[PDB]
Design a protein around this ligand. Structure first.
Ligand SMILES: Nc1ncnc2c1ncn2[C@@H]1O[C@H](COP(=O)(O)OP(=O)(O)OP(=O)(O)O)[C@@H](O)[C@H]1O
Ligand SMILES: Nc1ncnc2c1ncn2[C@@H]1O[C@H](COP(=O)(O)OP(=O)(O)OP(=O)(O)O)[C@@H](O)[C@H]1O
Ligand SMILES: Cc1cn([C@H]2C[C@H](O)[C@@H](COP(=O)(O)OP(=O)(O)OP(=O)(O)O)O2)c(=O)[nH]c1=O
Ligand SMILES: [Mg+2]
Ligand SMILES: [Mg+2]
Ligand SMILES: [Mn+2]
Ligand SMILES: [Mn+2]
Ligand SMILES: [Mn+2]
Ligand SMILES: [Mn+2]
Lengths: 289, 683, 683, 289
C-alpha cells in the first residue's frame, strides 16, 4: 500500500554535498568557545560513525532479507543515500572545520568512547543476528534500524540544530537538516516494513515482540542519558537534550505502530527554529427494510 | 503541573474499583481558587468595570446605552444571585479559555460567566430590563445557550458576526464564481462557515460561448474556493472552513469526490473545503433497481430547458433528460457511486449526504425554492435563490443566500425547570434579535435573505445526558418517545412564538403566503396524530408541563392562519461542539462518543467525564460507537419529524464494519426520512 | 513526412560545406503547393466569401458595413496586388497555424495572408477606403505588424480582446484583493496577460483591524492569483499567464522571491505567476555602499504617513522610515538580496527587474503617478493610480490601470522602404483606433485608463536582422548609432502623430497639462543634442529619409505646446514572440538566440534560419549568448533613451558565468539607464 | 587511482525516467507491425529481468565483498541505478505504450522463457557463490557482472537503438541511451576491479581464470544466439543482432583486460546512428563602471 509513494518521496528528496558551500561557516566557527567546538566535533563524529554502520550493514542487510522488487529498490536507494551522500557530507563538514590531525584525534576518541560504542554495537549486533527466512529476527533488526534512524541520531542532531536556530554554522546546519530529513523518511519506511511482520504474528508473539521493543528502547534510552551528560554538561544543555531524546523516542515508537512511552514535553524553541475500510459490494435487499 | 490538573487527573485513579468523579468537582474549586480568582480583574463596582470595558474598546456602547446603569446593575445582580457553579473543571476551563473576555495581551480575565451572560442578555433585550432579566435567568439556569458566535461576540466591540453558518448559491458564470469567492472570503473574515452550492456550475468539458471542452468543471472552482478559505482564516486564529455541495447527478460528481481521496494528486486534492453530496430519491431508486444511471452536464440542460439541473425535480425530469438528445450525459453505476461514497466516508468522513427528497417532502417553503444543499454542518436546510452577479456597471440580480442564527436548548435543564414553553419562546426572541441586528455589507444575497426569510435555528443539546441521567437507554423506544414528545413541544412553542412575533410586528417572512404554514398543510400530522408520550415513565418525565394535543395544534394552526409566521425557518439542530462543555451537556442530540474523554491542552492532559456520569448511570451513558446505528437513525428521524430544518447527524462506526454496512446505514437513514448525514467517524 | 518538411530539413544537410538556405524557399513552395492551397477554402467571388464568413459568425458585421462592397474589394485587390510570398517555410507555417482563420472543425483555411491583412486594414480604417488601402500597403510590405491579439482577432466575431497587456493596482484590503482576483480572471478570459502590483499590500505579520500577526502577506495573495490564473486559461487553450510585482523594500520581498525557488514547498511556490521586483535607486545605493538595508511593513508606513510605501519617493523617504519608531522594519543585507536575485534569475529567469528611478527620471507623467511596476513582459511603464474597491452597495473609487496597445515596426522593411515617418504615423493611427475600440466591462480601472490616458505601445523588431543583413555587428558602435538615429526618428514621428491627432480631435490625454510634454521638458535633450548618425555607413543607410534635426525638434516642441499630445504613452518594445516568424524578422530589438533554430511540431522536426542568413552574413548574425552583455545593455539603453516606456530586455547568459556576472550586468543596466530587465536565459 | 573519478561520473549522470515525457512515442508505436511490437516488448522485458537481478543481487553482493568506503559508495550507487532507475524505466515505457493485459503477458513470458531463465540462473548462481575473503569466487562473479553489463544487455539494446536511428520511438530510445551510457561505465568499473584480483595471481592461476572467463563467455554466447533467434526471426533481424552481440562481447573481454575473441564485422549503420549556478559575492568594484 505504500512502497511506490515512498519511492516518489525518496527520489524527489535527492541531493548532493556539493550543492551547499561550506566555507562561510568559518565566520561563526571561530567565535565558539573550546567546549562548544569540542562538543560539536564529538557529536559530528558520533553521527558519522553510526551512519556508516547504517550504510555498510543496516540498509543493505534489510534490503537483502525483505521480499519484493519495489521494496528492494527503495531500500537500495536509501543505502545509496547513506554511503554516497550522507557519508561524503559528514566528511566535507569535518574537513572544513578542523585540520587533518584534529579529525583523526576526535575519531580516535569517539571510537574508544564507552557510550557511543555501547549503542553502536547493540544496533550492529541485531543486524548480525538476522537469519535467512526468519521474519522474527528480521523484525528485531528493523526495530533496531528504526531506533537508529528516528531516535539515536537525535542526541547528536540537537547541537547542529541548536546552532542553526541561532544563525551559527548555517551551511553545515543546512546539510544536517537535509540528512535528518532523509533519516526521518528512512525510519518511517522501515517502520512500516516492521509493522507488516508484526501484524502477521499471533497475539502471544505480538506481546513478546512488544516486550522486545520496549526492553531494547529502555537499554538504549538509559545509555543515551549517559551519552548526553558526557557531551552536553560542558555546554549546559543536557536537560533540554533529554527532552528532545524522549520526544524522538516517541516518534520512533509511533513509526513501529506502538504507543508513545514518554509523556509529552515542549522542545527548546531554538532547536525548533532549526527544525481504508473493507470494500464490500451492495448485495441488494440492503435497499429494503 | 497545576493543582486542578492533578485533581482532574485523579478521576481516572480508581478507588475501590470505581472512578473518582467527585475529584472533578474539587478540580473546579482549585481552578477557581488558584487561577480564575487570581487572574480575574476586579473593580470597585460595576460602574468602573463597564466604563473600563467601554472606553478600552471591549464593549459596544450602543447596546449598553439603552439601559440606565441601575437597570444594568439589576441585571448583573440577577445573574450573580443564582450563585452558578461549574460542576466540572472542563466546563469552566472551556468558558474561560474560549468565551470569557480577556485583556488585549490576554494576561487577565475581564469577564466572568455571570458577566458574559449579563452582557449577552442585555444585548438580547435591546433596552428591556425585564426581558434582560428573563434572558439572564434563562442562561444562568443554562436552559438556553446562544451559539458560539453569539455567546462569544455579543456586545463586544472587537466582535465578528453573530451568525455561525452561511450558504451561498453560485451561478454558472465567471462573474458569479468570482463574486462567490469574494463573499466566501468576506464571510470567513467575519468568522462564519461558508457553504457553496456548486451544482449550477457546468461540468468539465463544457462550452464557454461555442468553444467546447473549455470548462474546468466544479473542481477548478473548488480549488479557487479552497485557496480563498485558506487565505481568509479568521486572521490566522481559526482555520478557514468551507463546504462545497454538489448534486449526485452532476457529471463532476466523481471528480468532486476525488477531491477527498487520500491518493488524489495535488492539482485535484482539496484539503480545507468540506464536500457534501445531494442525493435525490431518483438516485436511490436507480441504485436499488441496479439500473445504470446517468450524470448530466448542467449547461446543456440549462440551454435546452432554460432552468438549471438542480432547479427542477429530478424524480420527474430524469427520464426527459435521458431521452433528450440535446442534453449531454455520462453513464454511471449508481451502486458503484454509493460504494464510492461509503468508501470515502470511511476513509475521511466525507462527503456530507443530503437526501434532497427527504428534505423537500416536508419543506414548508418549496414555493420560494427547493432546498438544494446544506451548510458546513449539514443541518441548515432552507430555500435559496441563486443570484445573477452581472458585469461591472451592470445591476446585479440579488437572490437569497441562506443564513440562520444558532441557539441550543439544554434538554436536561429545560425539562428539570419544566419550562419548555418559556425557554423556547425566549430563545426564539433572542434568535430573532440576532437576525434583526445582523447586517452584512459584503454579502448582498445573505443580507437580503436575512431581511426577508428571517430564518433562525433553535437547536437542542444534552439529549443523551438527560436520557442517561434519567435511566433511559438512548436506543430504547422510551428515548424515542421522549424525543418525539419533547421536540413536538419545541416545534409547537416555536411556531407559537413565531406567530406571536408576526402578530406583534404585523409582518411575516417574505413569500409566507405560499408556504405550507399559510395553507395549513404543515399542521396536518399535528392535527390528526397525538404526540403525547406512549410510556408512563416519559409521561411522568413530562409532568407539570402541558403537552400540546391535537386541539392545541388546531388552535395554533388557526392562529398562524390569522397572523402568519415571522420566521421561515425556526429549528435546526447544530453539532454544538465546544459550547456544550460550558453548559455541562452532551453535544447536540447525538449520543456521546466516549464516557470520559482525554484531551491534551498545552503539555498537560485532562479528563472530562460526561455530565452526570456515575456508577449507577455508567451503562446508560453508552458510547455511540457501541450503539446500533439503525436505532440512532430511528432517534434522529423521530426528532427530525418535528424539526423544519435538518439535524447534524454524525454516524459513529466501528473499524470492523465494512463499506456495505455504511451504505446500509445511509439507505436506512434515507428510508426513515433522515434529511442529512454529517460525518462518518470511525473508532 | 511531408515533402515541405523534408525540403526544410534539407537545410542542415551541408553541400560544399555550406547550409542549403535556399532550399527553405523551395519548402515554402511545397507548403503551398501540397498543403495550403489544397486546404484553403475558395469562393466564386469575394462577395460570397464575405457573406459566408459574416453569416457563419467568423467576422463582425459592424466593421464591414462601414464600407461599400466595391471599397472592400478594392482593398482586397490592393492586398493581393503585392503578390506577397513568404520567404521561409516557418513564416507561412506560423501564420497558417496561429493566425489564419480556420473553420469550426479546424481542417480548412478560410483566410490567406492577404485576406487577414485586408480584414485588419478595414478594421483599422473604420470606414475610410483610402486609409484601409494605406494600411494594406503597410502590412503587405510588412513594414508594420499589429500585435498577436490585434492581428489575430481584428474583424473576428469569435475573438478575445485586442489588448493583452494589463497592469492592475491592488489596494491593501480584502475587497480590493478579491476585486483584483476577479479582474485578473476576467482579463485572462479575454486572453490578456495580467500584471498586478502587490507593493501596496501589507506584509506578513501585520495587523488587520488592530489584531496582531494576522496578515498572510503578499504570498497568500500570490497563491490566490496563481489559482485564478490557472482557472482562467483562455477556455483551455493557453496556460493562464500572470505577473506579480513587488517593491524590493517591501518586507515580503524574500518570501516573494522564495515563491520561485525550486526548494519551495507546495504552499509557497507559485508556478503560473511570474514575479517582478521593483528596485529603487536607494536599494542600489545601499548595496553599493554595503550599508545594511531595511525592508518595511507597508501598513505601518501607511498608518504613519497616510500614503502607501510605493506611492512616495524612497530616496527621500528611506531615512525617515528608518528613523521613525512607528514604522516597523526588518534588517536585510542588500548585497545578499542582489545575490539572491541573481541566483534566482540563473535558476529560473525570475524575477523581472524594474529600476524605478531609471523609469521615473524620464517619465513624462510623474504628475499623474510614478511608474511603480511593469507588465508581464516588463516593457510597459506607465503611471497608474490605485482603485478603492469598497464593500457592496457602496461606490468604488476607480483609479487608473494600465493597458497599452501593442504594435511593432519591422526595422528592415521600414528602412528599406525609406518610410519611417509614414509607417510610424499609420501605426500610431491604427493603435489609436484599437485603443478607442477597446471596451472592457469587467475591469473598471483598465477601461477608465484606456479612455483617459489613450496610451499605446509602438514597438520595433528585426533590429538584429536589419543590422546583420547590412554588415553591422549588433555590438558595434555603428549598430548603436543606427539604433539611436532610427528610434529618435520613431519618437519624433510618434510625437508628431500624437500631436496631430490631438489637434484634429481637439483633445489630449487626461492630465496632459502637467506632463513634461506640456512643459517642454521632454524635448530638452532633443532641442540640444543632435541625433544624426555619427558614422558614414549609418548616414548612407538613412539616405533618402529626412532625419529630424534640433530645429525640427524645436518645431515639434512648439507644435506639442500649441496642440497637446493625444497619447500619454506611445512607444514600448514588446518581445514580439510569434509575429516575428510571420514577418520573417528577428524578435524585438533583442539579438538572435540561434542562427538556425530547431523546433518539434507534432512528431516532425523543422528548421528556421534567421531571416536573410547566408554565408556572407553568417558572422554578423552572432548569437546572443556569444555576445558581450555589456554591449547589449549599451544598445538597449541607446534605444531606451528614445522610448517613453520600457523595452523587453532579456539577458542571454552562458552556463559558465556566475551570479556575480549576472549582478554586474544588472548593475551596469541600472547605471546605463536600463528601465527593465526581462529574462535571464542561460544557454 | 580511479574510484573518485567514477564516483563523480556516476553521480553526475544521475537521472529519472520521469524527466522524459513518453506520450510522443504513441504514434510511431501504434504504426509498428504486431511482430515488431511483440519483439520490442519482449526485448525490454528481458532487460528488465537482468536489471532486476543486477540491482537486487549482483551490485549489492559485490559491494559487500569489495573493501573501501569509496569503492562501496560507487557500487551502492550503481546498484540503486539498476533497480530504482533502470528496471523501473522499462515499466514507464510499458505503461505508456501497452495495455495492462499485454504488460501482464510479457512478465509471465519472462518467467517461462528458457533462455532468459538459463542466463539468470548462470549469472545469479555465480553472485551467490561468492565466499567471504575468497577473491577467486569474487573475480568469477565480477566476470559474470561484466558479461551482464557489456555483453548480455546488447541483444536487448539493439532494437530500441535500431528504431532510434530511424527516427522512431525516440523518447523510449532516449531512456535506453541513458541506461546504455550507465552500463558502459558500470562494465568498465567492475572490469577494473576484476583485473585487480586477476593481477594478484600466479601465471598458472591466471591461465585458469582466462579459461573460466572464455568458457563462461562461450556458454552465455551460445544461449544468447538461441534467445536472439527466438526474438528476432519474426522481424528479420537475427543475423544483424548476432553481429552486434559479438561486437559487444569483445568490449566485455576488453573491460576484463583480455584480447578480443570474435572477428570484426560491419554493424547496421542504423544502430550506429542510434548511438543551481556558481555563486560569487559582489565586490565593491562591481558597483562602479
Ligand atoms: N465551581 C465554581 N464555579 C464557579 N465559580 C466558582 C467555583 N468554585 C469557586 N468559584 C468562585 O470562587 C469563589 C470561592 O468561594 P467558594 O466557592 O470556595 O466559597 P465561599 O468562600 O464560602 O463563598 P461562596 O460559595 O458563597 O461564593 C466563589 O465565591 C466563586 O466566585
Ligand atoms: N512562397 C510562397 N508564399 C506565399 N504563397 C505562395 C508561395 N508559393 C506559392 N504560393 C501560393 O501558390 C500559388 C502558386 O504560385 P506559383 O509559385 O506556382 O506561381 P505563380 O505565378 O505565383 O501562380 P499564380 O497563378 O497562383 O499567381 C501562388 O499564387 C500563391 O497563392
Ligand atoms: C472564463 C472561464 C469560465 N469557465 C466556466 C466556469 C463558469 O461556470 C462557466 C460560465 O462562464 P461565463 O462567465 O458565463 O462565460 P460566458 O458568459 O462568456 O460564456 P456563456 O455565454 O456560455 O455563459 O464557464 C471556466 O471553467 N474557465 C474559465 O476560464
Ligand atoms: Mg454566462
Ligand atoms: Mg482596510
Ligand atoms: Mn544517513
Ligand atoms: Mn538513514
Ligand atoms: Mn542497468
Ligand atoms: Mn549496470
Amino acid at each position: 500500500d505504500f512502497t511506490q509513494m515512498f519511492y516518489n518521496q525518496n527520489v524527489k528528496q535527492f541531493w548532493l554535498p556539493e550543492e551547499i558551500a561550506l566555507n562561510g561557516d568559518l565566520l561563526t566557527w571561530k567565535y565558539l568557545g573550546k567546549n562548544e567546538q569540542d562538543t560539536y566535533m564529538k557529536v559530528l563524529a558520533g553521527l558519522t560513525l553510526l551512519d556508516t554502520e547504517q550504510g555498510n550493514t543496516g540498509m543493505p542487510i534489510v534490503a537483502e532479507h525483505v521480499d519484493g522488487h519495489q521494496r528492494k529498490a527503495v531500500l537500495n536507494f536509501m543505502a545509496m543515500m547513506e554511503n554516497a551522500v550522507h557519508a561524503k557530507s559528514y566528511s566535507n563538514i569535518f574537513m572544513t572545520l578542523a585540520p587533518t590531525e584534529t579529525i583523526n584525534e576526535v575519531f580516535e576518541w569517539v571510537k574508544q568512547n564507552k557510550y557511543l560504542q555501547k549503542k553502536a554495537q547493540m544496533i550492529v549486533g541485531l543486524y548480525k543476528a538476522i537469519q535467512k527466512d526468519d521474519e522474527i529476527s528480521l523484525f528485531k533488526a528493523m526495530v533496531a534500524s528504526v531506533y537508529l534512524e528516528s531516535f539515536l541520531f537525535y542526541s547528536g542532531f540537537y547541537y547542529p540544530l541548536y546552532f542553526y536556530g541561532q544563525g551559527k554554522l548555517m551551511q553545515s546546519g543546512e546539510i544536517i537538516n537535509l540528512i535528518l530529513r532523509d533519516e526521518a523518511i528512512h525510519g518511517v519506511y522501515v517502520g512500516l516494513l516492521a509493522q507488516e511482520i508484526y501484524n502477521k504474528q499471533t497475539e502471544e508473539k505480538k506481546a513478546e515482540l512488544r516486550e522486545f521493543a520496549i526492553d531494547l528502547l529502555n537499554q538504549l534510552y538509559e545509555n543515551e542519558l549517559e551519552y548526553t551528560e558526557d557531551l552536553y554538561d560542558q555546554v549546559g544543555l543536557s536537560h533540554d537534550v533529554k527532552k528532545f531524546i524522549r520526544y524522538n523516542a516517541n516518534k520512533a515508537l509511533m513509526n513501529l505502530g506502538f504507543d508513545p512511552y514518554f509523556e509529552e514535553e515542549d522542545i527548546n524553541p531554538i532547536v525548533l527554529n532549526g527544525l481504508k475500510a473493507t470494500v464490500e459490494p451492495l448485495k441488494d435487499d440492503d435497499f429494503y427494510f | 503541573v497545576p493543582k486542578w490538573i492533578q485533581l482532574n487527573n485523579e478521576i481516572m485513579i480508581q478507588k475501590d474499583g470505581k472512578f473518582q468523579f467527585d475529584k472533578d468537582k474539587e478540580a473546579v474549586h482549585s481552578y477557581f481558587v488558584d487561577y480564575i480568582n487570581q487572574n480575574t480583574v476586579f473593580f470597585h463596582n460595576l460602574k468602573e468595570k463597564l466604563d473600563y470595558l467601554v472606553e478600552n474598546q471591549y464593549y459596544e456602547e450602543e447596546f449598553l446605552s439603552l439601559y440606565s446603569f441601575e437597570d444594568i446593575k439589576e441585571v448583573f445582580k440577577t445573574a450573580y444571585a443564582k450563585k452558578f457553579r461549574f460542576p466540572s473543571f472542563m466546563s469552566a476551563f472551556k468558558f474561560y479559555n474560549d468565551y470569557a473576555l480577556k485583556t488585549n495581551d490576554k494576561k487577565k480575565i475581564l469577564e466572568r460567566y455571570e458577566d458574559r451572560i449579563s452582557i449577552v442578555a442585555l444585548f438580547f433585550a435591546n433596552g428591556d430590563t425585564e426581558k434582560a432579566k428573563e434572558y439572564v435567568n434563562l442562561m444562568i439556569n443554562q436552559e438556553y445557550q446562544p451559539s458560539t458566535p453569539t455567546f462569544l461576540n455579543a456586545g463586544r466591540k472587537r466582535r465578528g458576526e453573530l451568525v455561525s453558518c452561511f450558504l451561498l448559491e453560485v451561478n454558472d458564470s465567471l462573474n458569479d464564481i468570482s463574486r462567490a469567492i469574494d463573499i466566501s472570503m468576506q464571510l470567513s473574515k467575519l468568522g462564519g462557515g461558508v457553504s457553496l452550492n456548486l451544482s449550477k456550475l457546468r461540468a468539465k468539458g463544457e462550452a464557454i460561448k461555442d468553444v467546447e471542452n473549455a470548462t474546468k468543471g466544479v473542481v477548478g472552482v473548488m480549488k479557487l474556493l479552497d485557496n480563498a478559505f485558506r487565505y481568509a482564516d479568521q486572521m490566522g486564529q481559526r482555520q478557514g472552513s468551507g463546504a462545497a455541495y454538489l448534486n449526485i447527478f452532476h457529471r463532476d460528481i466523481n471528480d468532486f469526490l476525488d477531491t477527498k481521496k487520500i491518493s488524489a494528486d495535488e492539482d485535484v486534492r482539496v484539503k480545507t473545503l468540506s464536500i457534501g453530496v445531494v442525493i435525490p430519491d431518483k438516485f436511490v431508486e436507480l441504485a436499488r433497481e441496479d439500473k445504470a444511471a446517468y450524470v448530466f452536464y448542467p449547461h446543456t440542460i440549462y440551454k435546452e430547458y432554460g432552468q438549471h439541473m438542480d432547479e427542477m425535480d429530478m424524480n420527474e425530469m430524469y427520464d426527459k433528460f435521458v431521452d433528450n438528445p440535446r442534453v449531454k450525459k455520462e453513464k454511471i453505476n449508481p451502486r458503484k457511486l454509493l460504494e464510492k461514497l461509503a468508501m470515502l466516508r470511511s476513509e475521511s468522513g466525507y462527503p456530507y449526504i443530503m437526501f434532497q427528497d427527504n428534505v423537500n417532502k416536508v419543506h414548508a417553503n418549496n414555493h420560494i425554492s427547493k432546498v438544494k444543499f446544506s451548510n458546513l454542518c449539514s443541518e441548515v436546510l432552507q430555500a435559496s435563490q441563486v443570484s445573477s452577479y452581472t458585469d461591472y456597471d451592470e445591476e446585479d440580480e440579488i437572490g437569497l443566500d441562506i443564513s440562520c442564527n444558532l441557539g441550543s436548548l439544554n434538554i436536561l435543564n429545560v425539562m428539570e425547570h419544566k419550562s419548555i414553553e418559556k425557554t423556547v419562546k425566549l430563545a426564539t426572541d433572542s434568535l430573532t434579535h440576532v437576525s434583526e441586528t445582523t447586517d452584512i455589507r459584503n454579502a448582498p444575497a445573505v443580507r437580503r435573505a436575512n431581511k426577508a426569510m428571517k430564518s433562525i435555528g433553535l437547536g437542542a443539546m444534552n439529549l443523551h445526558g438527560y436520557l442517561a441521567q434519567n435511566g433511559i437507554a438512548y436506543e430504547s423506544p422510551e428515548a424515542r418517545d421522549f424525543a418525539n414528545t419533547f421536540f413536538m413541544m419545541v416545534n409547537f412553542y416555536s411556531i407559537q412564538r413565531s406567530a406571536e412575533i408576526a402578530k406583534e410586528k404585523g409582518e411575516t417572512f417574505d413569500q409566507y403566503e405560499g408556504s405550507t404554514y399559510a395553507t395549513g398543510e404543515y399542521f396536518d400530522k399535528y392535527v390528526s396524530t397525538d404526540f403525547s408520550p406512549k410510556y408512563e415513565k416519559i409521561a411522568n418525565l413530562f409532568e407539570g408541563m402541558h403537552i400540546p394535543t391535537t386541539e392545541d395544534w388546531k388552535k395554533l394552526k388557526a392562529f398562524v392562519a390569522e397572523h402568519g409566521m415571522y420566521h421561515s425557518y425556526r429549528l435546526c439542530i447544530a453539532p454544538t461542539g465546544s459550547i456544550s462543555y460550558v453548559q455541562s451537556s452532551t453535544a447536540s442530540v447525538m449520543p456521546i462518543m466516549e464516557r470520559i474523554e482525554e484531551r491534551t491542552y498545552g503539555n498537560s492532559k485532562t479528563y472530562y467525564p460526561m455530565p452526570g456520569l456515575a456508577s449507577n448511570n455508567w451503562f446508560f451513558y453508552k458510547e455511540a460507537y457501541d450503539m446500533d446505528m439503525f436505532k440512532v437513525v430511528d432517534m434522529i428521524a423521530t426528532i427530525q419529524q418535528h424539526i423544519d430544518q435538518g439535524i447534524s447527524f454524525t454516524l459513529f462506526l466501528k473499524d470492523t464494519m465494512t463499506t456495505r454496512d455504511l451504505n446500509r446505514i445511509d439507505l436506512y437513514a434515507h428510508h426513515r426520512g433522515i434529511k442529512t448525514i454529517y460525518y462518518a467517524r470511525t473508532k
